[PDB]
Amino acid sequence: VSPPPPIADEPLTVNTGIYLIECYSLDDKAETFKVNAFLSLSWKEPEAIWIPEIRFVNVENARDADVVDISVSPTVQYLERFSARVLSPLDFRRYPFDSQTLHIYLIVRSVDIVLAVDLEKVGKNDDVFLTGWDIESFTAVVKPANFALEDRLESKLDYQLRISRQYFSYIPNIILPMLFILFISWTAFWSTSYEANVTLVVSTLIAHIAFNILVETNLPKTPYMTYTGAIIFMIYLFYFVAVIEVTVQHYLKVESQPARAASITRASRIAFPVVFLLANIILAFLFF
Amino acid sequence: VSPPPPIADEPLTVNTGIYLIECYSLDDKAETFKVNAFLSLSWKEPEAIWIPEIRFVNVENARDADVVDISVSPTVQYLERFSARVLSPLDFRRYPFDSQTLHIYLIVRSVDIVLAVDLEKVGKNDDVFLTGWDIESFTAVVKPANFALEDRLESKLDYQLRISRQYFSYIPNIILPMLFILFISWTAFWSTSYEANVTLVVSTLIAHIAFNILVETNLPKTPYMTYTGAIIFMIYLFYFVAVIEVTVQHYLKVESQPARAASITRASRIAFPVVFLLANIILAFLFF
Amino acid sequence: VSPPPPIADEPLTVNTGIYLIECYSLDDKAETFKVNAFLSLSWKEPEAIWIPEIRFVNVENARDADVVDISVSPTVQYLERFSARVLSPLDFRRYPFDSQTLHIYLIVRSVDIVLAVDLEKVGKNDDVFLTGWDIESFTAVVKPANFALEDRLESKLDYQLRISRQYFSYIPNIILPMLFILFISWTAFWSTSYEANVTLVVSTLIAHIAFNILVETNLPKTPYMTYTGAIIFMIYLFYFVAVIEVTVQHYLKVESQPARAASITRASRIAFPVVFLLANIILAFLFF
Amino acid sequence: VSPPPPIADEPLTVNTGIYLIECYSLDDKAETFKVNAFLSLSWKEPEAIWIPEIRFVNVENARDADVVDISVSPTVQYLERFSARVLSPLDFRRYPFDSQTLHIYLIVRSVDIVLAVDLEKVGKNDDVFLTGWDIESFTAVVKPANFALEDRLESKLDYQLRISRQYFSYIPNIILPMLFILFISWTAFWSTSYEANVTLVVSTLIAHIAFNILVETNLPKTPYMTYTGAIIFMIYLFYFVAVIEVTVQHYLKVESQPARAASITRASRIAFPVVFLLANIILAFLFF
Amino acid sequence: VSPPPPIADEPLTVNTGIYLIECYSLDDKAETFKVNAFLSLSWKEPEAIWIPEIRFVNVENARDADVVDISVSPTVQYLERFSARVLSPLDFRRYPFDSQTLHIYLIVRSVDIVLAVDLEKVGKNDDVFLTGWDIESFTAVVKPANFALEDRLESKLDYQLRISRQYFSYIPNIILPMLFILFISWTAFWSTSYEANVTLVVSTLIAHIAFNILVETNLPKTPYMTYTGAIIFMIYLFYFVAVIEVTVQHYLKVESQPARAASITRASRIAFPVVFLLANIILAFLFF
């Protein structure tokens, strides 16, 4: 009913480890993800011993805990399965090419301790390999500066999981068709008729708006300006410039200046591919 | 089991403070936001002392409370972590440029007290800086006139958080492309052919409706008339006026009055940019 | 632990009142709204006296109750805060111009009573003025005929809140742009070219379908035929009639009958504004 | 604390009845509907007698029960209000014209009984008339063959509610505008110009896709092939055939065969109304 | 209160079986499905005997359990109804033609056992036949290598349900109309006019984007590249190639090279049907 009294040091290094079991959800819009796994505590029946009530910080509602096995040994092991939605922000600074770092902050209440880690206990389960994500590093750090509101010194032993998106699907499902729509838009330049070029640019503008609807159905729409948030803006800019160019060409052609009209057509034709590649490169450099 | 009896004054100024931890959600459509933070009470084990059961007013369902640390001293500190969705209305009177003030009304039940504040305890955590929002002021006021239904005098010590939106993304993701669509619409004026101008205005009207779909996916659609709710209406007005102008121009051109047709084209061309800027300025002045 | 025995009359008129605090939600699609307020009971510590367990009828799940103040006096007052989603149907017979009446049916279990009201206790809080709605009347009625399944005579003392929508936003955000789309559609009549009139009517039909998408994002889509459900149908009817008229005009023009073609154009031009106004008036009279 | 021992027959015919109060929701997409009503048990204070714990089969999560009145008589009545989402599948074999039968399977645990019904107790409340639905029959059947996993003989006394949709709104809000779009599509036939007929058919194909979006916002999208799932397919078929017909007509007209072109136009004009009516009749006969 | 002590073997083969009752939901987007059925345990009143607390692994939140019948015999049967959302991933590698295998991992806590199966007890209920799915096999395997974090040897006796989609609706509701849109797109080739072919290809590109919206409303959008994720990409590729082909044809026709223009038209006309069939066959072979 009480922690083991006799020790010269006030804190006890109870080995705390976590091993993933199944990431039930990764809610981008809710900005949190639901994790369902079990944690192991080594402290050296539900009330067989004094269980250090190690709590969590980044938690929506009190973790759905369930003791699995509390083994004793001439120390004690304690593995408990739990499900909890962790309120870890993830910055969609680069949505199709991300390096999001999921955090779990574990803090232990103190009476009459200090959290620790176990190298063997921790580790993502190979059979629990995540769907659509890749794991780069899975470490733990004892940083006591995480919280400063409480006067008493407390150290939060957080777990960091660096995760990068599998991006071999987004290139052929989101980014590339926008380029195809833009390419159809440019193909208006080689044509001549106003009555055809106008529809071939504005109908494809309809196409781009609808396609942005299609992507938005999946995107989380962070308040930042995403890398997607810039390529979309660049495409709107280029559609506006293309409509301006075709209108100028027709204005010259009706005002009997065909030479400058042809010059503008040639310049735009050899420019927009080049200037768009340059602009995309500039945005990539800014979002490297 | 009882509050400390001997004091000449019926109320005790138990220091009540709150420090944010993680704003789990800001649900515009639900008109509430979910806050997960811990509150500290200074009153001068779960049942170690008499905990003043300070309750909240703006709460959906009873706050998910969890005691963190109840320290005693030769007064007593009591820090408790809690998660609660606060039912604080926020007026989207100016959606892209807002100054919304989140409220939390704390009231203490009285038997045989008066809420107070602690300057040091309160304060937004720097590491808990919100995503997509900026904090202007974080104050507390003891206003007993908040509720008048109960005859007994009670004072609600509310916390006010003034928050303004980071608007460097909405200008390049919502407002500006609508202007680009409208600009493409105007570019029909310099043209001449009816069979081209008609499609160049109505196809871009399709574009504007679809783009309003794209924004609506994000907007909360308050029953007010938002600043967005006016610019959208103004754009529909200008598309209707543009279609009227082009139809009149063609009606004159087929009725053999080319001079007035050219006059109308020139007037509209030099007018709609100017009149639209004037109208947007007028709406801005009305929504300053 | 027992109700006060000695009284010649079996029921006791415990004064029951409710004062709104914050209408947390008004879910049109769910057909229920979530109310968070406190109720006061005057019956002449949680177990200080015998609390008449007055229950509710229109409740999704058992009300989230919380006692606030149970005061005693040489009678007893009992104010309790609660949150509950009330399953009160609201008929969207006229969506932009509604008079929906929210109901709350309170019934008291009887052993060894009769519900009552307090004029002073009841009343909407001025600071709790609802967002996007207006209150016309807030009354209470003791109608024992509400339920007849139980043989024992019981009276349900329901509270009625008559609420009408603020409609100064829907006219400039929903109804009017549909009229603008229809007006653009009509503007095809003054034109002559088939290749232009066809696109100017069917592209704007695209516009109307997309705009109905935009409204549907907000509408609840009741199984009735709403007033919106009729104006939409009327607009589809008028687009079909307009396409029929333009096709007939072109069929006559290619069949070398220009006189009747011009006659039909003039008739339709002077008719559709008039006949549409008449039809909208007829629908308004039917939905007065 | 125990059932009444002395009776020669092991089961007791405790009269079980249900009367609806408010169908809180009918979730098509979730394939379940939430019912909030009270059930009455006649068995011949919460622990006043032995309450036969009659449970339900088609239940998502344990029914939210609440005892209302347990009356005793020199038998005993027991009316309890409850809210529960019942997992009753409903087959959208004919979405606009359905005859869906909602089921509620009640089974009584046996120790040391047999469920029964009461004609007077059961019955839909007239004031609880459902919104957008009509009730055809409300019966109860004791069919012990419902479940066979348990060796011990048990009879499930299910309640059946036959409900048919009010279809006076779907004809003027879903089915008819699709016909109007198709009619606009056909009106291309009487025209002659390719540059006009092509847009008048494919723009209206855009219209049909968008309108299917509008309906899909409401439909549940069952994995069957609905009657809607066939009319939609038929409309796509007819748009494809119409585009084929107009392309063939233009191919003949440019290949200098105007006679066969006119013949094809006349044949299609007099055919597609007739063949579409025949095809819709065939689908109706298949889905009678 | 304790397991039956005297047995030479530490584990007891308590027969564990599950029989489905109603699959309440199959949430593709949530990647989990909600099952509501009852499980039977044969171990050789709630506390009549020692119930082996067999827990589950793939569970969102602790299973909503409810004991149904705990029968004793001179062994003991124990049937308990439960509802639980199982976190079983399903790979949408082939969305319209899938072979998804739902898993349920059952593990028994050990003190002072080994899970087993019963051939008769297990089995899908015929009256509980799933809606929109077909069952191929329903087996159980004792594989102790499922989890390796715990040092103590434990065997998880998982149940596997192989389920394949009824695909007689997706072919006539999703795949085929995309082919119809593409066919309308190709029908532009036989035509000649640029002003007509351009609209007949880009308007139908609008159609394809909107139709992808319609399908996306139903699809779960897995991060893989689905078979749908390839046919969609192929259709965008073919629209881009078709626009390129028509623009090249018009560029040649205005540059006075009609012979090569006609040659390109004929080649594309006889190619795109053939090359598209070949490409779809190649994708099918890759996704066999």
Author numbering:
A (entry chain C), B (entry chain B), C (entry chain A), D (entry chain E), E (entry chain D): 5 to 48, 67 to 96, 99 to 136, 140 to 315
Pull text from the paper:
Pentameric ligand-gated ion channels are major mediators of fast synaptic transmission in the mammalian nervous system and serve a variety of biological roles across evolution. The extracellular domain (ECD) of each subunit contains β-strands β1–β10, with the characteristic Cys- or Pro-loop connecting β6–β7, and loops A–F enclosing a canonical ligand-binding site at the interface between principal and complementary subunits. The transmembrane domain (TMD) contains α-helices M1–M4, with M2 lining the channel pore, and an intracellular domain of varying length (2–80 residues) inserted between M3 and M4. GLIC has been thoroughly documented as a proton-gated ion channel, conducting currents in response to low extracellular pH with half-maximal activation around pH 5 (8).
To characterize the resting state of the prokaryotic pentameric channel GLIC, we first obtained single-particle cryo-EM data under resting conditions (pH 7), resulting in a map to 4.1 Å overall resolution. Local resolution was between 3.5 and 4.0 Å in the TMD, including complete backbone traces for all four transmembrane helices. Side chains in the TMD core were clearly resolved, including a constriction at the I233 hydrophobic gate (I9′, 2.9 Å Cβ-atom radius), consistent with a closed pore. Whereas some extracellular regions were similarly well resolved, local resolution in the ECD was generally lower, with some atoms that could not be definitively built in the β1–β2 loop, β8–β9 loop (loop F), and at the apical end of the ECD. In simulations of the pH-7 structure under deprotonated conditions, the K248 side chain was attracted down in each subunit towards the negatively charged E243; similar to the starting structure, these residues formed an electrostatic contact in >70% of trajectory frames. These environmental ions were not coordinated by other protein motifs in a rigid binding site, potentially explaining poorly resolved densities in this region in neutral-pH structures. The apparent resting state (pH 7) was characterized by relatively low reconstructed resolution and flexibility in the ECD, particularly at the domain interface and peripheral surfaces, potentially conferring entropic favorability.
